[PDB]
Input
Amino acid sequence: ARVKGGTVTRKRRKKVLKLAKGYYGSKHTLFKSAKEQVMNSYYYAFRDRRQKKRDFRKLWIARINAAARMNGLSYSKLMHGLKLAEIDINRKMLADLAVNDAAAFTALAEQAKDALSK
Amino acid sequence: MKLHELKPAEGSRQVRNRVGRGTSSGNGKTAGRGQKGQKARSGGGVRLG
Amino acid sequence: QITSAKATAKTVRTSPRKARLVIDLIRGKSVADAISILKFTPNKSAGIIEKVLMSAVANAENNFDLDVESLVVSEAFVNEGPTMKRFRPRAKGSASPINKRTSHITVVVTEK
Amino acid sequence: MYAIIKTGGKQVKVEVGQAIYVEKLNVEAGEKVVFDEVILVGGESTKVGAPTVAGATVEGTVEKHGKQKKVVTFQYKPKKHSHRKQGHRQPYTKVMIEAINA
Amino acid sequence: MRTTYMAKAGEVERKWYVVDATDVPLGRLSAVVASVLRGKNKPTFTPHVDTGDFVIVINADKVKLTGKKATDKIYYRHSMYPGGLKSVTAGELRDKNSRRLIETSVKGMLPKNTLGRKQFTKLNVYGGAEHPHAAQQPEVLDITN
RNA sequence: UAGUGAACCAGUACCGUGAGGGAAAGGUGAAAAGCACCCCGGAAGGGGAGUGAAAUAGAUCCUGAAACCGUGUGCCUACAACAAGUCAAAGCUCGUUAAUGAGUGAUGGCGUGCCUUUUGUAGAAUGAACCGGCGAGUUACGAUUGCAUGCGAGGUUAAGUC
RNA sequence: AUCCGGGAGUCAGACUGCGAGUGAUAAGAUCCGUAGUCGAAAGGGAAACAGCCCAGACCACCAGCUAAGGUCCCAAAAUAU
RNA sequence: GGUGUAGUGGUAGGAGAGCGUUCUAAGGGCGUUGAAGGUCGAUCGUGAGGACGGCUGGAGCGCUUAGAAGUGAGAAUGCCG
Output
């Protein structure tokens, strides 16, 4: 009942190495050091699936900043006026409307001018 | 009942512990014994009483 | 119809780093000039690749090709052969090994 | 023809004759889907969105029920002993678009 | 992966602006100028591409230094040799090399990427009141900032 | 690398004056039919032509992984401080177990490896040159509890004979 | 929460509000009583930072709101009244 | 099966369910019209892991239920090549 260790280890180690195509050194072809940056790549993937959302809110805020300042409104009085006008647009949608549709962004800008004018 | 369809009595033949066989089984790296001390050496433990 | 005869020489008793120096100077040239190129380098790896190219020319004549004046050295390799292993008595009792290495050399002679 | 439609938590830009990749909708393939909350109607004369602009039904049909790629989310903590291993693969429904307000 | 604009290199047109400096302090000139060059005041960011503009400066430098700091803000350079600190400047750079004031107190205001170099070579600082760059038709800003 | 130390001309070669210590080394093909003859070279070695179902089965001879050494080419690279990844992304090249495709990657954000021992580690505490193979809670006889089974005021054989 | 029974690890703790000694009414010193965090806890802030202030991640999203702390540029938001 | 409400960081350690290797038994199978082994692929499951296809290979091996273990490697200034 002598059991050798025939073909298990190759299957493990090559499933590791296919996760490591394109590593900028001898981290293609060394088993002890390929099994480490895969671990750190998983830590960084856990971080970075949660810093997508930290990033794009800052980008859409900056684009809302520029396009709002073009119409004589600072970048927060839009927020307070649009909530007094009871409008619930996501910051993505105001970002790309602020880039493309100048007419629509000025229409929302004038209703936000009218809202807090009371 | 015949040879190729055997069934045991339920709840009546357990499996085992295989101790010191990997960190996520629960009992690898010091095998259920812990850190240093003479209970964790080879054949340690004082006599009874 | 085939061109590009081959010629090898296996387990040549020369070190494989040094023979890659000479084959820097041959890849991509005409045959009739590269022999003259080989005849002036003063190395042990000079007087071997001569014999490889001349056997490749003789293969292309007596087997397939024509037109010796229209042959181009297209490919040339250096690979490592098996290594002998011996020792040397170094001072204060001990000993340190000595490798002795061998190489395989191939040259392919296309027409154009 | 713009339409900005609340679907789930998210907001989507909508045109005529495209596809949107949205979450599950409990509707068989295939059939008709009628979204209701519409903020904007664009184009030329912008219907500015008071929340639930009235009389704004955006219709559509369904093509598949499919899944994204896996998301290998392994956690470890160094110089200690831990392995949590998962795999997650959400379902997805394509949405053809037809017939903004007319 | 969905729809937000990621501008390319040759999509955004650039402009040319002219800014005076008659009796405005350093920090606020440098702040408005450095917020110009990254591409702010334009709704079409990337954090990749030079979406910024070109800025020309007239009358370097006549910049104020508020209260004191005429003789006080000592700059410092060290020359990687022993004892080589050279505090050679003061507020003396108002008189000589008034190019060199704004080319330091704006380079500090920028990032230090490679874009903090391609966005720095768009300044032009002149202590006098002349454009050699009149071939490019620059416009005028108004600073109430 | 198992199984005697040893499947092979082994207590042999080798080491110590001596008592003594002690290795490594299996495999062509069904059949040797083991490459007549020609060609370069002093030969070794190769290229044709043959033998053979197969010669990348040519005597180091079944299959032939990894480190390691080379050749050719799709994309990038000479104002740049980089635990070497990951998120975002232009361009160029390609076309799959057809699907929210594959290769590369100018550029921006963020980011001090792996074990062990510790009140505490990136540590200038301690271990690994790299790859492959071997390499650690078992068994016998007793004791105690949980679960299951057959009988139950009863239960049950040992040594030993066929 | 109590009782009966099977199975262990632990006996080198640390700093910070507090309140007391020996110290010189000194120390990231030492020795105890009380509460928290680290040990066995990842995310935000104090430039970076085990123990301080806020808050305890089953997983995905290019959705929304607030705490501690912030709003001239790096670097997100007031050159606010 | 619905539908609600609640919970789901974690070292030493306690408990439960599974993946994988070699052999034995019984049933049922595959294989010179290509088995094991090797290489490549843009595939499936929550996990260890499992299929199918292209090439190389040239004689044996999976599948279901039960049983027995020389049953799983990255670290010992580990041993051998």
Q: What stands out?
A: Chain A has one domain: 1-118. Helices of chain A lie at 8-17, 31-48, 52-70, 77-84, 91-99, 102-115. Chain A touches chain E through 15 residues (CB under 8 Å).
